Design a protein around this ligand. Sequence first.
Ligand SMILES: COc1cc(C(=O)[O-])ccc1O
Ligand SMILES: COc1cc(C(=O)[O-])ccc1O
Lengths: 197, 196
Amino acid sequence: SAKDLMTLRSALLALLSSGPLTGYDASQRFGASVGFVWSGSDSQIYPELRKMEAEELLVGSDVPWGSKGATKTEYALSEKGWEALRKAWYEPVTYGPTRDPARLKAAYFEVGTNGDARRHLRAHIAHFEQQKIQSESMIDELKAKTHPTLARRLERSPKKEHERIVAFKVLAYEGQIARAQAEIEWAEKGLKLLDTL
Amino acid sequence: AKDLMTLRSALLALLSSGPLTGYDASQRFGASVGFVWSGSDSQIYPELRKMEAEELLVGSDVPWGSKGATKTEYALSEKGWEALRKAWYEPVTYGPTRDPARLKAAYFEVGTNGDARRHLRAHIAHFEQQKIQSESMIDELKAKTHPTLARRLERSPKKEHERIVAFKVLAYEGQIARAQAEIEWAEKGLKLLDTL
Ligand SMILES: COc1cc(C(=O)[O-])ccc1O
Ligand SMILES: COc1cc(C(=O)[O-])ccc1O
């Protein structure tokens, strides 16, 4: 799916707007930040970074790596990269069709026992409770301004803009929390349904 | 990859309501299970062919029109039924979050506050709509008039009907709960935009 690749491209542009990174660092920072809302692995990120440089959306250059005298290629947005980010953001969100394996499972719980359905709904609750705690913990790092990608972004932004920049990162994680809480409530409603069947 | 095995599970679930030709499978899928696990023609048709080749479905020729043409109808085999049961037993595999609206919101500072309002209003509209669609679906499930549900019920012992229907409704109640959460989130975002 090419639409998903283009979205990964947009997430990399967003991350790299906080400052240039090597390939390895980009993938580590990605997974610890934007990766919580659009996940990308090493094997997805490395080839896209290379295409983006080939397309001249990114500029590559050699900087010191470690302290033994090794250098590594760090990627920075070009002016074309900056334009592409702006254009990507302006475009409307394309909503992909619903693919929810848990709702799929629930729709046909009759294939198994009511005890099996309870186990599925408890595993749903477990999953979204742990997501909620991660999201709440991420908000705390964002509001403290200690998250390392956020801190780098802020050091490159005028102080006048910090409230805005932080507010939007928080907003994203409030959305993960709101959804998590709806999923838990839904599963709990399902558990009560199962006692009446 | 694993997405194909999930679509396969969706197709076994749908075909447990009775045999279908490829076209009617795709059509009924899009009007039922496709609302919670979507499949396009480019995935459904070849998955059906793979499922027949692995003997989970039996294809047979049935009359197509009245001039002696035929078409292929697919029924679950015994191995298909077994596969459906074994699939359902396994834990749900939760994929990592890929949400294009959350990604957009995270970096709203890339555009103007006006651009952010447009995105959140489009988000509200989209989920207000999903909500109304799911509510319409629940009315026809509860009325037992949805044609796939009706066919499923004609083939099931009366004792199982309450359970069969409740679970379809549960799935749509999930769609409604998520949609309402998305709307509330976006409204909070709109209020936030006014403070900046
Ligand atoms: C979207 O998630 C995040 C983004 C950033 C950032 O790009 O500055 C930092 C921390 C995060 O959790
Ligand atoms: C999971 O969604 C549905 C499934 C069925 C069914 O297989 O009987 C009918 C209507 C639906 O909306």
